[PDB]
Design a protein around this ligand. Structure first.
Ligand SMILES: [Zn+2]
Ligand SMILES: [Zn+2]
Lengths: 222, 673, 108, 114
C-alpha cells in the first residue's frame, strides 16, 4: 500500500481491452449519453471470408457506422486507470484497435457544408465603421489623479518632527531584529519626517553602503 | 491584409499581466471607418481622393479597438471593465479597394467627383504624391534544397527556411552539411566524410547523431530508421557508418544537451542553465513550421531524418541537385504580405511602451488609466514614413532597411501607368556581374514577359508579368487536412517505420503529415474535387512525382498561376454550348466564374506545370495520326498571352529581330499622348 | 469457424462518469515483453522534472528488475476521442474514454 | 557486407578478433554481447559502379502522361503490345543513352533493357 505502487492484476490476469478511435462530433454526441449513459447497440457479423462490426446510435442519442479494424502490432497497448479515490489499476491489454468511418451516407460537398457549420466562430474580421466614433471626451479631474488625492489627504507618510526621546525607542527596537535595514524602510517604520530621522541617526550611528547601491544605516556599538 | 491579417496580429498577442494587486489588459476586436479629415477647428468630414492630391493631404482611415481591463488583487472580488472602440492610429488606404470612398460607384458618380472612370486604382496617396508598391521576389520557404558549394569545406549542403504560419518576425534557417572527401589527413582518410549540422543560435558545428539524441532516441537502431527507410541498401548504410564513430562516446541525453548547450549566445557557467538553454533552442528555434509546442517531438525527428535521407541521395547520385533560379522555387511579396510584416514591428513596439508607462505609474500605487498610455503617433507616422521614402525599416533605422520599394507612379502615358502596377523585382544587387540571375529561364513561359526589360545596369533584374498571369492570395490548410485523414491516410505517430518503403509520403504546405498506399486514386479524387469547387478552392496546386514517390500540396500566398483548358481523352471539354451562352453575358449573368465552376478551365501553377502535357492549339495538335503524343492533358487558349503590356502593342512582333522588341517596350513608355 | 460463421449483436453504453481515469500504456512489439514475468510493478511520475503532465516511471520486478520510461503523446483528443470498449457479463458493451497516451520504452 | 545490431542494447556490433580459435567475433561496445561471423568478410568497395538501374526503376512509372510510348516492342511476360521507354536520368552519364522499357499493362510491371 503506497502511492507509487502499481497494481499489476490486469496484466497478470492477461486482461484484454479494445481500443476504438472515434470522431469528435460523435464524441460530442456521446458526451450527451442517453439517460445515465446508454448510446446504442454494436452489431458484430463474422463470416468465412469477412467480418463486420458496426455501432448504431441510441434512438435518444440520435436526437450505420462501419468499423475499420487497425493493427496493434509493433506496439503493445494496455489500459491503466486512476480512480476518483486516486487508486491505480491496470484493467487490461489491448487486443483490438478500430476506426469509425462514414459509408455511402455522405460525399465531399456536404461534408464541407458540415465543416462550415462546425466553423461557428470564423477567425474574426476587420469590420467597416460608419463615419467616425468619438475619441476625445471632456473630463475635468483625471480619474487616476482623484484617487491619489484621497490617499495623500487621508494619511501623511511622514508626520511630526517631534518627541526625540520617544522616537529613539521606536528606532532601537527595529535594530534588535536586524543588523541591517535599507534607509527607506527606516523612514517607513517610524513616521518621523526625513530630516529629523537623519539627525537622530547621524547622532546615534553611521551609514554603510557595503558597495551594493542600497545603503543601510548601522548603529555604533560603541 | 486588412480583413484577416490585421485582426490576427492583435488577437494573437500576449496579455500584459503586471504588478499587491495586479492588472489585466487584452485586445478583442478591430474596427475601421471611412477616410476622414479633421478640419482646423476639429469638425470631421470625409475626404475625397481629389482634395488629397490638391491640398497635399494623406488618404488614410482611423483605427479602433476594444480593450478589457480586469484587476486581480484577490480582494474578494475580480473587478473587470472594458473600453470599447479605443483610438489607435491611422492606416493608409489603397484606392478603389473595398474600404475606399470610390468602391462600387457608377460612371455618373465617378465623373461627379472629378475622377476618371478609366483610372485603374491600386496606389496610395501620401502627402499629395501617388505611391505604388513593387512586388519583391523571395526564395520559397518550408522546403528542402540541395546545393553544392565548390569553394568551401562542404561537399554538399541542405537548407530549410521555416516560419510558423505568419507569426514570427525572423525565419530560422538550418543547414545540414557534409564535409569534403579530400581532407588531407592520415586519420579521417579511412572513415570518410561526416555529416554535420549548423543549428541557429549556436557558435559551433554539431554532429547530427548528437542532436538526434537530444530529442531522445539514444539507441542506434532507432536513429537509423528515421534516416534510412529500407535496410536492404548496403550502399547508403556504409555512408552513414562514419557518422556514428565520432558521436560514440557521448551516449546519453543529458550530456548531449550539455554539449550543444555549452556553445550558445551565452556560455553557461552552471549545468542546469545549459540543459535549460539547450532545451528551448532545440524546441522553439529548430524547424518551427512542423510544430512549436514542447510536445509532438517525434515529428521534428522524422523531418530531420528526411532532410538527411535526401542529402545522401544527392551524394550517391540518385537525384539531381536543386536549381536556384527555377521559377517554381520563388514567391512574391505583394502589398499584403509587406504591410503585415511592417505592422507587427509597430504593434509590439506599441505594447512595449504601455508597460514602461504602467510600471512608472503603478509603483506609486495610485491607479491606472489607459487612454493616456497609448502613443497614437507610433502606427500613424510609422507606416506613412516608410511608404513615402521607400526604405523598408524604421526612422532611426535608415541604414538597416531594404531600399527601392514604394516609388512614384509614372503618369507619362496611359500604357506607362498600367506597366507600372504590374512589375516584379529581384532583390539581388544592381551591379553584380553574375549572369545566371539575369538570363532568361525556361520556366518563365507564360508568366513573365520575355521581351520587356530595361537596358543599362538593371538588365533582367526588373521584369513585368504576362497578361493572364494571376498571383495567389492564400488560404488555410484546415479543410484539406480534415478530408485527408478520412480518406485512409495513416498519421506519422501510429505507424511502423518498416511500412514506409512502398508508400508515398504526403506533404501539405511543407509539413510531412502522413503516408498513403494507393496514391493514383487519391490524386484523381483530389482533382475532381477542385474542378467543381466543393472543399478545395481553385488556387491550390497539387504535385505528384511518380519517381521520387511523394505528393505535395500548397495553399500559401505568392505562387503564380495562369489558366489553361482541360482536355479529356483527346477532345476539349469546351463544347459549343458554352460559347453561344457566353456571348450573352450582358443579360444572362453567365461569366468567367460560371466557367471555372463547371470544370472546363483550371489554374496551373509553375511546379504543377512540370507534370503536365500541353497542346498549343486544338484543331492542329489533337488529331489522331502518326502523332507526336497522345496523352495531352491541357491546351492553351491563345499563345499570344505570353507577352506583357508594353510588348503587346507591336504589330507582327514575330517578324522582327529579338533585341528590337526589347527597345520598343522600353520606348513606348515615354511617348506623348 | 465462428470467426467466419459467427453473428451477434450487443448493446453499447457510454457512462457520463467513471471511478478512475483511463490511459493507454503502449509497448513496442519488437520487445515481445512477457507480462507473466511481471511479478510486481511500481509506477510513479518521473523525477527528472524535479503532475498530470509528468512522464511515468515504471519499475517492474523491483527497482531494477525492470524499468521503463513513459512519455506523453502530443495529442489524444485533438480531432477524435479514443474509447476503451469492454465486454460485460450481460454481453453488452461498455465504452471507456482514453484520457492520455504515454509511450513506454526499455531502459538499460 | 550488411550490418549487425546488438540483441541487448540495440546498437552497432563491431568486429573483433580472438586469439584462440581463429574465428571472427562480433562484439558490442556498450555491453559485451558476442557471436561469430558466418561470411567472414568485412569491407567491400565497388569502384566500377556498374549497377544496372533495372533494380532501381519503379513499376508505376507507366502512369506518367509525359513519357513516350511504343507499339513496336511488346512485353514478354504478358504479351502486351504497348511500352513506355526512357533514359538513365541518373549519374554515370558518360555513355548513357540506353533505353529502358516498362510494360504499361495493369499489374504487369515488367521491365527490360535492350
Ligand atoms: Zn550491445
Ligand atoms: Zn507486360
Amino acid at each position: 500500500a503506497e502511492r507509487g505502487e502499481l497494481d499489476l492484476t490486469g496484466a497478470k490476469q492477461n486482461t484484454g481491452v479494445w481500443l476504438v478511435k472515434v470522431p469528435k462530433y460523435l464524441s460530442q454526441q456521446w458526451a450527451k449519453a442517453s439517460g445515465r449513459g446508454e448510446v446504442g447497440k454494436l452489431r458484430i457479423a463474422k463470416t468465412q471470408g469477412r467480418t463486420e462490426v458496426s455501432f448504431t446510435l441510441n434512438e435518444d442519442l440520435a436526437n450505420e457506422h462501419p468499423f475499420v479494424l487497425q493493427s496493434v502490432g509493433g506496439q503493445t497497448l494496455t489500459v491503466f486507470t486512476e480512480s476518483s479515490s486516486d487508486k491505480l489499476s491496470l484493467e487490461g491489454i489491448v487486443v483490438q484497435r478500430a476506426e469509425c468511418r462514414p459509408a455511402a451516407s455522405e460525399n465531399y460537398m456536404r461534408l464541407k457544408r458540415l465543416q462550415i457549420e462546425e466553423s461557428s466562430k470564423p477567425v474574426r474580421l476587420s469590420q467597416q465603421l460608419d463615419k467616425v466614433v468619438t475619441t476625445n471626451y471632456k473630463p475635468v479631474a483625471n480619474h487616476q489623479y482623484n484617487i491619489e488625492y484621497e490617499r495623500k489627504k487621508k494619511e501623511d507618510g511622514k508626520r511630526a518632527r517631534a518627541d526625540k526621546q520617544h522616537v529613539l525607542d521606536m528606532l532601537f527596537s527595529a535594530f534588535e531584529k536586524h543588523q541591517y535595514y535599507n534607509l527607506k524602510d527606516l523612514v517607513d517604520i517610524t513616521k518621523q519626517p526625513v530630516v529629523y530621522l537623519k539627525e537622530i541617526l547621524k547622532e546615534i550611528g553611521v551609514q554603510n553602503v557595503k558597495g551594493i547601491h542600497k545603503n543601510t544605516w548601522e548603529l555604533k556599538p560603541e | 491584409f486588412i480583413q484577416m491579417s490585421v485582426q490576427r496580429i492583435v488577437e494573437d498577442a500576449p496579455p500584459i499581466d503586471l504588478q499587491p494587486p495586479r492588472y489585466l489588459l487584452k485586445f478583442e476586436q478591430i474596427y475601421l471607418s471611412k477616410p476622414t479629415h479633421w478640419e482646423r477647428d476639429g469638425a470631421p468630414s470625409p475626404m475625397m481622393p481629389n482634395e488629397a492630391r490638391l491640398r497635399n493631404l494623406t488618404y488614410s482611415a482611423p483605427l479602433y479597438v476594444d480593450i478589457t481591463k480586469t484587476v486581480i488583487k484577490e480582494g474578494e472580488e475580480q473587478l473587470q471593465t472594458q473600453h470599447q472602440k479605443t483610438f489607435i492610429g491611422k492606416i493608409p488606404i489603397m484606392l478603389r479597394s473595398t474600404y475606399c470612398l470610390l468602391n462600387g460607384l457608377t460612371d455618373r458618380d465617378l465623373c461627379e467627383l472629378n475622377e476618371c472612370p478609366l483610372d485603374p486604382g491600386g496606389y496610395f496617396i501620401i502627402n499629395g504624391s501617388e505611391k505604388v508598391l513593387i512586388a519583391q521576389e523571395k526564395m520559397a520557404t518550408n522546403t528542402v534544397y540541395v546545393f553544392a558549394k565548390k569553394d568551401s569545406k562542404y561537399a554538399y549542403t541542405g537548407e530549410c527556411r521555416s516560419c510558423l504560419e505568419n507569426s514570427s518576425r525572423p525565419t530560422s534557417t538550418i543547414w545540414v552539411s557534409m564535409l569534403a572527401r579530400g581532407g588531407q589527413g592520415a586519420k579521417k582518410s579511412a572513415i570518410g566524410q561526416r555529416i554535420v549540422a549548423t543549428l541557429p543560435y549556436i557558435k559551433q558545428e554539431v554532429p547530427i547523431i548528437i542532436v538526434f539524441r537530444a530529442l531522445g532516441f539514444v539507441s542506434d537502431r532507432d536513429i537509423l530508421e528515421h534516416i534510412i527507410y529500407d535496410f536492404e541498401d548496403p550502399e547508403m548504410m556504409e555512408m552513414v557508418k562514419p557518422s556514428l564513430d565520432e558521436a560514440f562516446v557521448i551516449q546519453e541525453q543529458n550530456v548531449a544537451l550539455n554539449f550543444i548547450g555549452s556553445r550558445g549566445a551565452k556560455p553557461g557557467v552552471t549545468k542546469e542553465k545549459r540543459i535549460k538553454y539547450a532545451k528551448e533552442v532545440l524546441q522553439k528555434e529548430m524547424l518551427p513550421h512542423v510544430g512549436v509546442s514542447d510536445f509532438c517531438e517525434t515529428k521534428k525527428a522524422y523531418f530531420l531524418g528526411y532532410m538527411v535521407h535526401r542529402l545522401l541521395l544527392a551524394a550517391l547520385g540518385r537525384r539531381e541537385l536543386d536549381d536556384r533560379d527555377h521559377y517554381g522555387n520563388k514567391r512574391l511579396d505583394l502589398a499584403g504580405p509587406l504591410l503585415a510584416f511592417l505592422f507587427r514591428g509597430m504593434f509590439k513596439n506599441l505594447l512595449k511602451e504601455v508597460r514602461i508607462y504602467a510600471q512608472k505609474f503603478i509603483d506609486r500605487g495610485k491607479d491606472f488609466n489607459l487612454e493616456l498610455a497609448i502613443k497614437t503617433r507610433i502606427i500613424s507616422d510609422g507606416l506613412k514614413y516608410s511608404l513615402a521614402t521607400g526604405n523598408w525599416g524604421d526612422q532611426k533605422k535608415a541604414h538597416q532597411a531594404r531600399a527601392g520599394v514604394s516609388q512614384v507612379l509614372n503618369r507619362l502615358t496611359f500604357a506607362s501607368t498600367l506597366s507600372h502596377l504590374r512589375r516584379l523585382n529581384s532583390p539581388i544587387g544592381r551591379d553584380g556581374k553574375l549572369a545566371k540571375p539575369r538570363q532568361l529561364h525556361n520556366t518563365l513561359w507564360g508568366m513573365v514577359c520575355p521581351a520587356e526589360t530595361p537596358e543599362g545596369h538593371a538588365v533582367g533584374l526588373v521584369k513585368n508579368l504576362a497578361l493572364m498571369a494571376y498571383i495567389s492570395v492564400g488560404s488555410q490548410p484546415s479543410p484539406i487536412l480534415e478530408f485527408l485523414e478520412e480518406w485512409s491516410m495513416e498519421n506519422l505517430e501510429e505507424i511502423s517505420p518498416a511500412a514506409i518503403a512502398d508508400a508515398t509520403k504526403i506533404f501539405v504546405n511543407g509539413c510531412w503529415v502522413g503516408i498513403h498506399k494507393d496514391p493514383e486514386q487519391l490524386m484523381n479524387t483530389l482533382r475532381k474535387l477542385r474542378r467543381q469547387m466543393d472543399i478545395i478552392v481553385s488556387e491550390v496546386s497539387m504535385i505528384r512525382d511518380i519517381r521520387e514517390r511523394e505528393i505535395r500540396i500548397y495553399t500559401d500566398a505568392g505562387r503564380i498561376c495562369r489558366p489553361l483548358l482541360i482536355v479529356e481523352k483527346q477532345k476539349l471539354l469546351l463544347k459549343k454550348r458554352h460559347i453561344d451562352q457566353l456571348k450573352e453575358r450582358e443579360y444572362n449573368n453567365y461569366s468567367w466564374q460560371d466557367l471555372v465552376a463547371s470544370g472546363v478551365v483550371e489554374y496551373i501553377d509553375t511546379l504543377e506545370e512540370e507534370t503536365v502535357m500541353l497542346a498549343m492549339t486544338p484543331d492542329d495538335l489533337q488529331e489522331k495520326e502518326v502523332a507526336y503524343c497522345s496523352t495531352y492533358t491541357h491546351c492553351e487558349i491563345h499563345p499570344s498571352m505570353i507577352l506583357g503590356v508594353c510588348a503587346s502593342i507591336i504589330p507582327f512582333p514575330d517578324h522582327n529581330q529579338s533585341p528590337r522588341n526589347t527597345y520598343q517596350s522600353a520606348m513606348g513608355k515615354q511617348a506623348m499622348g | 469457424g465462428p470467426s467466419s460463421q459467427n453473428v451477434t449483436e450487443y448493446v453499447v453504453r457510454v457512462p457520463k462518469n467513471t471511478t478512475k481515469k483511463y490511459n493507454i500504456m503502449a509497448f513496442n512489439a519488437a520487445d515481445k515483453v512477457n507480462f507473466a514475468t511481471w511479478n510486481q510493478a511500481r509506477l510513479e511520475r518521473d523525477l527528472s522534472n524535479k503532475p498530470e503532465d509528468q512522464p511515468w516511471l515504471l519499475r517492474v520486478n523491483g527497482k531494477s528488475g525492470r524499468k521503463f520510461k513513459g512519455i506523453k503523446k502530443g495529442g489524444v483528443t485533438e480531432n477524435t476521442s479514443y474509447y476503451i470498449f469492454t465486454q460485460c457479463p450481460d454481453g453488452a458493451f461498455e465504452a471507456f474514454p482514453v484520457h492520455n497516451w504515454y509511450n513506454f520504452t526499455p531502459l538499460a | 557486407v550488411g550490418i549487425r545490431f546488438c540483441q541487448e542494447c540495440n546498437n552497432m556490433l563491431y568486429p573483433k578478433e580472438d586469439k584462440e580459435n581463429r574465428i571472427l567475433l562480433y562484439a558490442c561496445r556498450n555491453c559485451d554481447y558476442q557471436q561469430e561471423a558466418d561470411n567472414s568478410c568485412i569491407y567491400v568497395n565497388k569502384i566500377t559502379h556498374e549497377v544496372d538501374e533495372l533494380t532501381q526503376i519503379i513499376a508505376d512509372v507507366s502512369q506518367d502522361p509525359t513519357l513516350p510510348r511504343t507499339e513496336d516492342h511488346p512485353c514478354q511476360k504478358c504479351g502486351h503490345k504497348e511500352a513506355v521507354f526512357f533514359q538513365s536520368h541518373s549519374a554515370r552519364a558518360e555513355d548513357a543513352m540506353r533505353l529502358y522499357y516498362v510494360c504499361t499493362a495493369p499489374h504487369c510491371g515488367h521491365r527490360w533493357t535492350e
